[PDB]
Amino acid sequence: TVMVNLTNPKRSSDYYNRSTSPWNLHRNEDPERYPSVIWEAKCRHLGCINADGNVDYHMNSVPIQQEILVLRRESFRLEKILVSVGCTCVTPIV
Amino acid sequence: TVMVNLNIHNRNTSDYYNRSTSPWNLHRNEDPERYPSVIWEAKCRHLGCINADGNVDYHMNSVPIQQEILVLRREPPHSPNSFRLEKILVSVGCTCVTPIVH
Ligand SMILES: O=C(O)c1cc(NCc2ccccc2OCCOCCOCCOc2ccccc2CNc2cc(C(=O)O)cc(-c3ccnc4ccccc34)c2)cc(-c2ccnc3c2CC=CC3)c1
């Protein structure tokens, strides 16, 4: 137990819309948490968008996750959580 | 100023990054004055994206995906706080974007 003294690009980025594996954000709010609001990505399609603007289901939209530090009120407890931050397009086999 | 229970935290030293059409490499961001002191950040391998033939198509863009994250910053011992909470940006991977539509 220690004493701790206490700009988001998602407010302006457009990759979620122009990606071949686009996504949308879901608001995760917790007033018992710092940060109080985090935004999690959910891939928009199963497959990926091809050059004709159609979903190619052989390719796979998958979410990229990042482990982040959060504070949970207890005075706080330091914890780690897994957040989906965007999606990428993968081939199922090389 | 708050009181943080660090509980069981201690310092430490999928293959999408390769199968993606916008593949990336991870680079070591190290700062002994920070917790976590090491963060692995992505840097896209190419300006373009990989096409069905396995070559790079530069009319498409590989771009990094960023996440704002909390980190602990070391405070001098003279200070009543052990740590200083900060926000930094980390690239977690890359995506392939079209530069223009239609
Ligand atoms: O097995 C597969 O097929 C395989 C496929 C891909 N990349 C191609 C690909 C990606 C995604 C879907 C299909 C793909 O291929 C389909 C068959 O090819 C049709 C040919 O198209 C020409 C090129 O197109 C691309 C080239 C690069 C990236 C994305 C695309 C296609 N998307 C696209 C193109 C364009 C453009 O303007 O061209 C515009 C948009 C667009 C984006 C967003 N909103 C829109 C809205 C409206 C209109 C367009 C859009 C999307 C890589 C690997 C692979 C991945 C990783 N390691 C390896 C390999 C393959 C081999 C070895 C290793 C394997």
Coordinates of C-alpha atoms and ligand atoms in Angstrom, one line a residue:
Chain A
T1 CA 0.0 0.0 0.0
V2 CA 1.6 3.2 -1.3
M3 CA 0.6 6.9 -1.8
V4 CA 0.1 7.7 -5.5
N5 CA -0.4 11.1 -7.0
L6 CA -3.0 11.1 -9.8
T7 CA -5.5 13.2 -25.2
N8 CA -7.1 9.8 -26.1
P9 CA -6.6 9.3 -29.9
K10 CA -9.8 7.4 -30.2
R11 CA -11.5 10.8 -29.9
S12 CA -10.2 11.6 -33.5
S13 CA -8.8 8.5 -35.3
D14 CA -10.4 7.1 -38.4
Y15 CA -8.7 3.7 -38.9
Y16 CA -11.7 1.9 -37.4
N17 CA -13.7 3.0 -40.6
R18 CA -11.0 2.7 -43.3
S19 CA -9.6 -0.6 -42.2
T20 CA -10.1 -3.8 -44.2
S21 CA -11.0 -5.3 -40.8
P22 CA -13.2 -2.4 -39.4
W23 CA -14.6 -2.2 -35.9
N24 CA -16.8 -0.2 -33.6
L25 CA -16.2 0.9 -30.0
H26 CA -18.3 -0.1 -27.0
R27 CA -18.3 2.1 -23.9
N28 CA -17.2 0.4 -20.7
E29 CA -17.9 2.9 -17.8
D30 CA -17.1 2.2 -14.2
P31 CA -17.3 5.0 -11.6
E32 CA -15.4 2.7 -9.2
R33 CA -12.4 2.7 -11.6
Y34 CA -9.7 4.9 -12.8
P35 CA -9.9 5.3 -15.9
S36 CA -13.7 5.6 -15.4
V37 CA -14.4 5.0 -19.1
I38 CA -12.5 2.7 -21.5
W39 CA -13.6 1.9 -25.1
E40 CA -13.4 -1.7 -26.3
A41 CA -13.3 -2.6 -30.0
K42 CA -15.6 -5.3 -31.5
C43 CA -14.8 -6.4 -35.1
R44 CA -17.5 -5.4 -37.4
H45 CA -17.3 -8.4 -39.8
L46 CA -16.3 -12.1 -39.6
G47 CA -14.1 -11.8 -42.7
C48 CA -12.2 -8.8 -44.2
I49 CA -13.2 -6.3 -46.9
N50 CA -11.9 -7.0 -50.3
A51 CA -11.1 -4.6 -53.2
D52 CA -14.8 -4.7 -54.3
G53 CA -16.0 -3.6 -50.9
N54 CA -17.4 -7.0 -50.0
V55 CA -16.6 -9.3 -47.0
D56 CA -14.1 -12.0 -47.9
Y57 CA -14.9 -14.8 -45.3
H58 CA -11.7 -16.8 -46.1
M59 CA -9.8 -13.9 -44.4
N60 CA -10.4 -13.3 -40.7
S61 CA -11.1 -10.0 -38.8
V62 CA -9.5 -10.5 -35.4
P63 CA -9.3 -8.2 -32.4
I64 CA -5.9 -7.1 -31.0
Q65 CA -5.7 -7.0 -27.2
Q66 CA -3.6 -5.0 -24.8
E67 CA -3.2 -5.6 -21.1
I68 CA -3.8 -2.3 -19.2
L69 CA -3.3 -1.1 -15.6
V70 CA -6.5 0.1 -13.8
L71 CA -7.3 1.2 -10.3
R72 CA -10.3 -0.3 -8.5
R73 CA -11.7 1.5 -5.4
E74 CA -11.1 -0.4 -2.2
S75 CA -8.0 4.0 -1.4
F76 CA -7.6 1.8 -4.5
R77 CA -6.3 -1.6 -5.7
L78 CA -4.0 -1.8 -8.7
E79 CA -5.2 -4.4 -11.2
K80 CA -4.6 -5.5 -14.8
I81 CA -7.3 -6.1 -17.5
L82 CA -7.3 -7.2 -21.1
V83 CA -8.9 -4.7 -23.6
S84 CA -9.6 -5.1 -27.3
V85 CA -8.3 -2.0 -28.9
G86 CA -8.8 -2.6 -32.7
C87 CA -9.0 -5.3 -35.3
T88 CA -6.6 -6.6 -37.9
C89 CA -7.0 -8.9 -40.9
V90 CA -5.3 -12.3 -40.8
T91 CA -4.9 -15.2 -43.3
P92 CA -5.9 -18.4 -41.5
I93 CA -2.8 -20.2 -42.9
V94 CA 0.6 -19.1 -44.2
Chain B
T1 CA -3.5 11.8 -4.1
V2 CA -4.7 8.2 -3.3
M3 CA -3.6 5.1 -1.5
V4 CA -3.0 2.2 -3.8
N5 CA -2.8 -1.5 -2.7
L6 CA -0.2 -2.9 -5.1
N7 CA -1.2 -6.4 -3.8
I8 CA 0.6 -9.1 -5.8
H9 CA 2.3 -6.9 -8.5
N10 CA 6.0 -7.5 -9.2
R11 CA 8.4 -6.4 -11.8
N12 CA 9.1 -8.5 -14.9
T13 CA 11.8 -8.4 -17.5
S14 CA -1.4 -15.6 -30.8
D15 CA 0.6 -15.2 -34.0
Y16 CA -1.5 -12.4 -35.6
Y17 CA 1.6 -10.3 -35.9
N18 CA 2.8 -12.6 -38.6
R19 CA -0.5 -13.7 -40.3
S20 CA -1.9 -10.2 -40.5
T21 CA -2.0 -8.4 -43.9
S22 CA -0.4 -5.5 -42.0
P23 CA 2.2 -7.5 -40.0
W24 CA 4.3 -5.9 -37.2
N25 CA 7.4 -6.4 -35.1
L26 CA 7.6 -5.7 -31.4
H27 CA 10.2 -3.3 -30.0
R28 CA 11.3 -2.9 -26.4
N29 CA 10.2 0.3 -24.7
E30 CA 12.3 0.3 -21.4
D31 CA 12.2 2.8 -18.6
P32 CA 13.5 1.8 -15.1
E33 CA 11.7 4.9 -13.7
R34 CA 8.3 3.3 -14.7
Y35 CA 6.1 0.5 -13.7
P36 CA 5.8 -1.6 -15.9
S37 CA 9.4 -0.8 -16.8
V38 CA 9.3 -2.7 -20.1
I39 CA 6.4 -2.3 -22.7
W40 CA 6.5 -4.1 -26.0
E41 CA 5.4 -1.7 -28.8
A42 CA 4.4 -2.7 -32.3
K43 CA 6.0 -1.2 -35.5
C44 CA 4.4 -2.2 -38.8
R45 CA 6.8 -4.1 -41.1
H46 CA 5.8 -2.3 -44.3
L47 CA 4.3 0.9 -45.6
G48 CA 1.9 -1.3 -47.5
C49 CA -0.2 -4.4 -46.9
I50 CA 0.4 -8.0 -47.9
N51 CA -1.7 -9.2 -50.9
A52 CA -3.0 -12.6 -51.8
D53 CA 0.3 -13.4 -53.6
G54 CA 2.3 -12.6 -50.4
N55 CA 3.8 -9.4 -51.9
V56 CA 3.4 -5.8 -50.5
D57 CA 0.8 -3.6 -52.1
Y58 CA 1.7 0.0 -51.4
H59 CA -1.6 1.5 -52.5
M60 CA -2.9 0.2 -49.1
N61 CA -1.5 1.4 -45.7
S62 CA -0.2 -0.6 -42.7
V63 CA -1.0 1.7 -39.8
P64 CA -0.4 1.2 -36.0
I65 CA -3.3 0.8 -33.6
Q66 CA -2.9 2.9 -30.4
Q67 CA -4.2 2.5 -26.9
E68 CA -3.9 5.0 -24.1
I69 CA -2.6 3.3 -20.9
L70 CA -1.9 4.1 -17.3
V71 CA 1.6 3.7 -16.0
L72 CA 3.3 4.3 -12.6
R73 CA 6.1 6.8 -12.6
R74 CA 8.9 6.9 -10.0
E75 CA 8.8 9.8 -7.5
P76 CA 12.0 11.1 -5.8
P77 CA 12.3 9.7 -2.2
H78 CA 12.0 13.2 -0.7
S79 CA 8.4 13.1 -1.9
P80 CA 5.4 11.9 0.1
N81 CA 4.2 9.9 -2.8
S82 CA 6.0 6.7 -3.9
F83 CA 4.5 6.9 -7.4
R84 CA 3.0 9.3 -10.0
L85 CA 0.1 8.1 -12.2
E86 CA 0.6 9.0 -15.9
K87 CA -1.1 8.4 -19.3
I88 CA 1.0 7.3 -22.3
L89 CA 0.2 5.9 -25.8
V90 CA 1.2 2.4 -26.9
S91 CA 1.0 0.8 -30.3
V92 CA -0.4 -2.7 -29.8
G93 CA -0.4 -3.9 -33.4
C94 CA -1.2 -2.8 -37.0
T95 CA -4.2 -2.7 -39.3
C96 CA -4.5 -2.3 -43.0
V97 CA -6.4 0.7 -44.2
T98 CA -7.6 2.0 -47.6
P99 CA -6.2 5.5 -48.2
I100 CA -9.3 6.5 -50.3
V101 CA -12.7 4.9 -51.0
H102 CA -14.3 4.7 -54.5
Ligands
LIG1 O1 -5.4 -15.8 -49.1 C1 -5.7 -14.6 -49.5 O2 -6.6 -14.2 -50.3 C2 -4.8 -13.5 -48.9 C3 -5.0 -12.2 -49.1 C4 -4.2 -11.2 -48.6 N1 -4.4 -9.8 -48.8 C5 -5.5 -9.6 -49.6 C6 -6.9 -9.4 -49.1 C7 -7.1 -8.8 -47.9 C8 -8.5 -8.7 -47.5 C9 -9.5 -9.3 -48.2 C10 -9.2 -9.9 -49.4 C11 -7.9 -10.0 -49.8 O3 -7.5 -10.7 -51.0 C12 -8.7 -11.0 -51.7 C13 -8.4 -11.6 -53.1 O4 -7.4 -10.8 -53.7 C14 -8.0 -9.9 -54.6 C15 -6.9 -9.0 -55.1 O5 -7.1 -7.6 -54.6 C16 -6.0 -6.8 -54.8 C17 -5.3 -6.5 -53.5 O6 -6.3 -6.2 -52.6 C18 -5.6 -6.0 -51.3 C19 -4.3 -6.0 -51.2 C20 -3.7 -5.8 -49.9 C21 -4.5 -5.7 -48.8 C22 -5.9 -5.8 -48.9 C23 -6.5 -6.0 -50.2 C24 -7.9 -6.1 -50.5 N2 -8.8 -5.3 -49.6 C25 -9.1 -4.0 -50.2 C26 -8.5 -3.5 -51.3 C27 -8.8 -2.3 -51.8 C28 -8.1 -1.8 -53.0 O7 -8.3 -0.6 -53.3 O8 -7.4 -2.6 -53.6 C29 -9.7 -1.4 -51.1 C30 -10.3 -2.0 -49.9 C31 -11.3 -1.3 -49.0 C32 -11.0 -1.2 -47.7 C33 -11.9 -0.7 -46.8 N3 -13.1 -0.3 -47.2 C34 -13.5 -0.4 -48.5 C35 -14.7 0.0 -48.9 C36 -15.1 -0.1 -50.2 C37 -14.2 -0.6 -51.2 C38 -12.9 -1.0 -50.8 C39 -12.6 -0.9 -49.4 C40 -10.0 -3.2 -49.5 C41 -3.1 -11.6 -47.8 C42 -2.8 -12.9 -47.6 C43 -1.6 -13.2 -46.8 C44 -1.5 -12.6 -45.6 C45 -0.4 -12.8 -44.8 N4 0.7 -13.5 -45.2 C46 0.6 -14.1 -46.4 C47 -0.5 -13.9 -47.3 C48 -0.5 -14.5 -48.6 C49 0.6 -15.3 -49.0 C50 1.7 -15.4 -48.2 C51 1.7 -14.8 -46.9 C52 -3.6 -13.9 -48.2

